[PDB]
């Protein structure tokens, strides 16, 4: 019979206490356990007493209980019988009192405690001021007698603190937070007075520490005199930091304090730094090796180290012009500045990230002093030259060391991700913004600054590194890769002429290095570095073409290299060099008669026969960029034809054979081929851009008829076998042609100098071929990329295509709506895409919407409400901007606007309010507020026509105030008419400051989740009544000018 829901009876405990142990211990049954306990949150908690009192896995079971109790308090509290409010009050206070000081509560985990304490914080968040006045006052004394009730009380104070200062944004209404602040502020002294007491006199370890920690969270808000007009900082440095355990809380505190703005407290900061350091030098010496002490140090010292990373970095970063204005601190900051360097050798690409935050800050600051080199020459008298700028003169020696750092620990410049597309495709996938690349760039920046401040020093350094690789026998792959990456970073940070000398030197000795080494594991990695380095300096390959050629030809050579990835190396390199040095490839260079491209094309097959699929593609992009240069339309055309001559032959063949038999376009190989032939065609078009039409035209119609073929060959299959056909070789393949086809069409329309023509030539064939077909496909076969390709091919044409949004929007609009209009799940693509498409026709084609059946247009709005009701943040957000947009696009047509309001206006306000008071869509916040806001603004004037219909004495302003209030009251019966009046009037007050309006929205979201009830009037009814006035008395100090 093991399935019991919980109704009334003399309801037992030995049972529930079994379901708990289930959910937390065993297996799949746990599903029904967990699924049942979620449900005992219905009627209420008359059991709370029942369980908590009568407690093996009790403490869990009690836990749960407390959960219920807490729901009760967070909400019902207000309309509770006042006496029962008291009953909880003393129930909890007492429960804690006992649960603390226990001859064993380490066992009765810090859990039950902390959630209990946590509850008490919850209660306090309700009455603490008005109905618990002796509270703080009392518990002070309550600790000074007993340590047990104290240690823990430090924790009550902690959570209270977070809850009222940290996490009060959202979890509390706007004004009640103000009232709890200047309330904790109020009687904070009697309790700081407490923590000190402890620190100065108590010897009980755990107590002391939980006070450090509770102090740590006080430091976010407590008034500054408590920090600086107090011997606090002194207590921490002299008394707590030097001490193994508190070692850390001590620092983190320090750190926090070191983070304020010195204005009035410079003296305190000076002594805090020097003192801290007396401590630190005493502790972690400066002759100590931080690298090991970390690698070998356990978690005891791991964090200490990372928090030094933070105290250091944040302080140096926020008190610098403080750490030089006295010849006396100069030596201390050096000590500290030296710590930073030690810490920076730490193998931990997260500590090192903090370290590099400073490093880069310094670099920037000393780049803003002087971005120039200390004019190199001594003076004719011999004297010092005086051109070293005031500050770096102070870090010279140490910037030498940070340069060493960047060029040593230089980070991986690129992030290649081998990983196979959703087509069974295996590819290389170049990432754009990853914490990785961020490491790279920040190091690059620091070495670019530190290069402008003395590039003679970078050169010098990077040569001692490279030397130490050739002979120097610091040789290792990793380190060579790091040397050349840092070489590739500092490109263009060097006077050209300077860097000519430089490169020639650098790589010359790397060709020398590459001969030296025996092998081919080494010969290759070397080589690769030579090729990054070299391709990193196109300024160079442009002033030195004999060399460009030489590097390109070498490139080609490596393009038959059968050693690992040497080939990928070569192609990347070539495409870099092609984009950058792209011009020299199509013009005649001193030294030969006919343009290099020619030879290249006249040799395509022999260069690229040992490449595999992708490699050849990248090659075609490669020569794309070259053909994109030649601007001479005649030659560019001849060139584009001979450039697309190889693939075109494949294509032309497959296309003869498909006349004779439209079956070969079902042939697994010939589709493998229409695929690769297209991927080529797409890269090509990418590098080549608009003139590529010459090619595209050539196949566009036929391409279309094959896209259309494959499409009907897939739906078919699918219609007769299930979406399951999709997970097999040939369907995947065909799909691929369709996709790469649409990626070809969007690809090319995306970058065209002409709209008119494209709209008049390449658009109408889409209609039947690609659009209507999408309609005719079976749902689970319709290609989503059609929608998004349409979307792209509307932003590029705009007005020109606005006359056809009828025809398109027919093929696709409804048929696709019906796929997205059951739930908010199936078809995620279609959802997102379809909506980018609607977004865009709306944007660049609103006239359309204007010229269609009111029933249709209606149908379009509806779908938009449908967007922003979505739980996927993109569909709903995209839906929102389509809304805010569309409101404004309405604004222009004075004609259509008015009626638009007379039908949809209120009928939009219902939907938006709906979402706003929905707990799910909270990334809307700024959009909801934005829109709602703009609409009420709008009301106060723009809506020139009567909605109520009782003439003008029911003018619109007041109407709306009214229907909004009614709408919300009825959806939320608990709210007293007061909470509502307040809010709604705040919709026309906070009207123009949407940061403020957003504030408001949340204010209300809190009000509904909690039963404010009759009696309670702690919602400062009036306080804010005038508060919104200050908002209204600015909208006309600004918007009347």
């Amino acid at each position: 019979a093991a399935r019991q829901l919980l109704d009334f009876s003399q309801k037992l405990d030995i049972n529930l206490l079994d379901n708990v142990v289930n959910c937390l211990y065993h297996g799949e049954g746990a599903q029904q356990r967990m699924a049942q306990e979620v449900l005992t949150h219905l009627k209420e908690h008359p059991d709370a007493w029942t369980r908590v009192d009568t407690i093996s896995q009790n403490m869990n079971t009690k836990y749960y209980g407390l959960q219920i109790l807490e729901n009760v308090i967070k909400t019902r509290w207000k309309i509770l019988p006042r006496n029962q409010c008291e009953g909880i009050k003393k129930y909890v206070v007492g429960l804690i009192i006992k649960t603390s000081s226990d001859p064993t509560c380490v066992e009765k985990e810090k859990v039950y405690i902390g959630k209990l304490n946590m509850i008490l914080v919850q209660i306090l968040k309700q009455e603490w001021p008005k109905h618990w006045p002796t509270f703080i006052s009392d518990i002070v004394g309550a600790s000074r007698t007993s340590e047990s009730l104290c240690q823990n009380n430090m924790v009550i104070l902690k959570l209270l603190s977070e809850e009222v200062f940290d996490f009060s944004s959202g979890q509390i209404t706007q004004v009640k937070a103000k009232h709890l602040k200047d309330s904790m502020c109020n009687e904070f002294s009697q309790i700081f007075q407490l923590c000190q007491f402890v620190m100065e006199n108590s010897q009980n370890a755990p107590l002391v520490h939980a006070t450090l920690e509770t102090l740590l969270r006080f430091l976010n808000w407590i008034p500054l005199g408590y920090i600086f007009e107090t011997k606090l900082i002194s207590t921490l440095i002299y008394k707590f930091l030097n001490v193994p355990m508190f070692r850390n809380v001590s620092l983190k505190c320090l750190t926090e304090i070191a983070g304020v703005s010195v204005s009035q407290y410079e003296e305190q900061f000076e002594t805090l730094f020097t003192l801290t350091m007396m401590q630190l030098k005493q502790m972690l010496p400066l002759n100590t090796n931080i690298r090991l002490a970390y690698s070998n140090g356990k978690d005891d010292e791991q964090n200490f180290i990372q928090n030094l990373s933070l105290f250091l970095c944040t302080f140096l970063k926020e008190h610098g012009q403080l750490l030089e204005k006295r010849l006396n601190l100069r030596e201390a900051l050096m000590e500290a500045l030296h710590y930073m360097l030690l810490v920076s050798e730490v193998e931990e690409t997260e500590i090192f990230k903090i370290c590099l935050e400073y490093w880069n800050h310094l670099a920037a600051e000393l780049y803003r002093e002087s971005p120039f080199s200390t004019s190199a020459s001594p003076l004719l008298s011999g004297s010092q030259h005086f051109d070293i700028p005031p500050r770096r003169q102070l870090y010279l020696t140490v910037l030498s060391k940070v340069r060493l750092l960047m060029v040593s620990r230089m980070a991986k410049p690129e992030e290649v991700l081998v990983v196979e597309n959703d087509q069974g495709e295996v590819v290389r996938e170049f990432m754009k913004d990853t914490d990785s690349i961020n490491l790279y760039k920040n190091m690059r920046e620091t070495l670019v600054y530190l290069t402008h401040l003395d590039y003679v020093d970078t050169e010098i350094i990077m040569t001692k590194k490279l030397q130490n690789q050739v002979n120097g026998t610091e040789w290792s792959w990793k380190n060579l890769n790091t040397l050349c990456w840092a070489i590739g970073s500092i490109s263009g940070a060097m006077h050209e002429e300077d860097e000519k000398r430089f490169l020639v030197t650098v790589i010359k000795d790397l060709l020398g290095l590459c001969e030296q080494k025996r092998g081919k594991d080494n010969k290759a990695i070397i080589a690769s570095n030579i090729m990054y380095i070299v391709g990193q300096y196109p300024r160079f390959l442009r002033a030195h073409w004999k060399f460009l050629k030489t590097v390109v030809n070498k490139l080609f050579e490596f393009m038959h290299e059968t050693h690992d990835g040497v080939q990928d190396m070569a192609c990347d390199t070539f495409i870099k060099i092609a984009q950058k040095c792209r011009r020299h490839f199509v013009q005649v260079q001193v030294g030969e008669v006919m343009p290099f491209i020619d030879e290249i094309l006249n040799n395509i097959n022999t260069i690229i026969c040992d490449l595999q699929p992708q490699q050849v593609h990248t090659f075609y992009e490669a020569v794309g960029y070259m053909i994109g240069a030649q601007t001479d339309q005649t030659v560019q055309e001849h060139l584009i034809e001979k450039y697309m001559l190889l693939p075109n032959q494949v294509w032309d063949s497959i296309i003869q054979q498909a006349t004779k038999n439209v079956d070969i376009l079902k042939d697994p190989e010939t589709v493998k081929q229409l695929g690769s032939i297209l991927k080529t065609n797409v890269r090509a078009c990418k590098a080549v851009g608009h003139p590529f039409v010459i090619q595209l035209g050539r196949i566009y119609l036929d391409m279309l008829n094959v896209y259309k073929c494959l499409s009907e060959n897939i739906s078919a299959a699918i219609q007769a076998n299930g979406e399951m056909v999709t997970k097999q070789p040939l369907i995947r393949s065909m799909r691929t042609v369709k996709r790469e086809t649409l990626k070809l069409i969007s690809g090319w329309v995306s970058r065209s100098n002409d709209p008119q023509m494209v709209a008049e030539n390449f658009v109408p064939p889409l209609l039947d071929a690609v659009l209507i077909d999408y309609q005719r496909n079976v749902p689970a076969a319709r290609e989503p990329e059609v929608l998004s390709t349409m979307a792209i091919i509307v932003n590029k044409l705009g007005g020109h295509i606005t006359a056809e949004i009828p025809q398109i929007f027919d093929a696709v609009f409804e048929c696709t709506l019906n796929m997205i209009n059951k739930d908010f799940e199936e078809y995620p693509e279609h959802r997102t895409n379809f909506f980018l498409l609607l977004q865009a026709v709306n944007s660049h084609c609103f006239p359309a919407f204007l010229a269609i059946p009111p029933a249709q247009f209606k149908l379009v709005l509806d779908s938009i409400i449908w967007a922003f009701k979505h739980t996927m943040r993109n569909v709903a957000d995209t839906g929102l901007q389509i809304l805010f947009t569309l409101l404004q696009n309405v604004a222009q047509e004075e004609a259509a606007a008015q009626s638009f309001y007379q039908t949809y206006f209120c009928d939009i306000l219902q939907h938006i309010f709906s979402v706003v008071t929905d707990t799910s869509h909270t990334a809307g916040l700024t959009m909801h507020a934005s829109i709602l806001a703009y609409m009420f603004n709008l009301v106060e004037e723009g809506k020139i026509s009567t909605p109520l219909n009782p003439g003008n004495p029911v003018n619109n302003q007041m109407f709306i105030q009214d229907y909004v209030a009614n709408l919300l009251k009825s959806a939320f019966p608990h709210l007293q008419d007061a909470q509502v009046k307040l809010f709604v009037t705040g919709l026309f007050s906070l009207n123009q400051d949407i940061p403020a309006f957003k504030e408001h929205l949340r204010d209300f979201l809190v009000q509904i989740k909690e039963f404010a009830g009759e009696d309670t009037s702690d919602l400062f009814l009036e306080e804010r009544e005038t508060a919104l006035r200050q908002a209204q008395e600015e909208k006309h100090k600004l918007q009347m000018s």
Binding site: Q306, V419, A923
Partner: protein
């Protein structure tokens, strides 16, 4: 040889997709929000035998919360997660951490930027700084491409076993 890893983050974060990738090498493109929790065992094989993370795949949405903290009880490690494409979801991180350590005084934990693959990222690695002072590991992951895909697990593993040079293996 096993452990309990609570998996927290807000709605649509990609918590569910993440673990499921991990459990089948499937990728789910559909958003269906977990209601309450749903613990999935997982296994990796390593330098030192096998290991199993008991992934308490918790919910994100307030609507469907469940027994939240109630699931964190007896947690031995964790993973707050967020979506680098919606700034909002990093702003709630602090709250998740909160509830978490209010149950687990010291348990190895990991923070995960997800969606690193959408080339319109709105949480600049510049902006991610939280873990630092709360002393959690951080990782850039995508469940759509397996960028730094198993970092989160390999790390925790190294921590719970007390072995820095513990590398995963094929078998």
């Amino acid at each position: 040889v096993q452990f309990k890893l609570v998996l927290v983050g807000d709605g649509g974060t990609g918590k569910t997709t993440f673990v499921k990738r991990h459990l089948t090498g499937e990728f789910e493109k559909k958003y269906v929000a977990t209601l309450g929790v749903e613990v999935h065992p997982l296994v990796f094989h390593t330098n030192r035998g096998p290991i199993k993370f008991n992934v308490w795949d918790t919910a994100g949405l307030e609507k469907f919360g469940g027994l939240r903290d109630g699931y964190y009880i007896q947690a031995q490690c964790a993973i707050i997660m967020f979506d680098v494409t919606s700034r909002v979801t990093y702003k709630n991180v602090p709250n998740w951490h909160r509830d978490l350590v209010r149950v687990c005084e010291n348990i190895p934990i990991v923070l995960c930027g997800n969606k690193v693959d959408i080339k319109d990222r709105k949480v600049k690695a510049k902006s991610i700084v939280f873990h630092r002072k709360k002393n959690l590991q951080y990782y850039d992951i995508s469940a759509k491409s397996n960028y730094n895909f198993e970092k989160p697990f390999l790390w925790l593993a190294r921590k719970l076993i007390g072995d820095p040079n513990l590398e995963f293996v094929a078998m």
